[PDB]
């Protein structure tokens, strides 16, 4: 008789998608990016700034 919206009513967030808890626990909405460090070839950044 009344569609209850998930994204509010966190209870019904759990009736469907139980993995909702794991996401919140591991935060996982702000998963930190494993740093890497490759850098662009000169040709790339040379055409970029090119007139």
């Amino acid at each position: 008789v009344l569609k209850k919206n998930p994204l509010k009513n966190k209870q019904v967030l759990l009736r469907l998608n139980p993995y909702a808890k794991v996401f919140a626990a591991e935060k996982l909405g702000s998963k930190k990016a494993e740093k890497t460090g490759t850098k662009p070839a000169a040709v790339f950044t040379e055409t970029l700034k090119h007139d």
């Binding site: 040709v43 790339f44 055409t47 090119h50 007139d51």
Partner: protein, 53 residues
């Protein structure tokens, strides 16, 4: 398209599976990498007006 549709239907049911017998429409391009080596981009500006008549 059918005489060669059964010709597929034999070897694709002898040697294995995955018929894929109906056609499908053109598909959006898949990822690809294009090199600047030997093809370093040419930069382009629009043209001023002239008459040449």
């Amino acid at each position: 398209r059918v005489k060669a549709n059964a010709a597929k239907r034999a070897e694709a049911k002898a040697q294995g599976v995955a018929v894929q017998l109906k056609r499908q429409p053109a598909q959006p391009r898949e990822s690809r990498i294009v090199s600047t080596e030997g093809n370093v981009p040419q930069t382009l500006a629009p043209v001023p007006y002239e008459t040449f008549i």
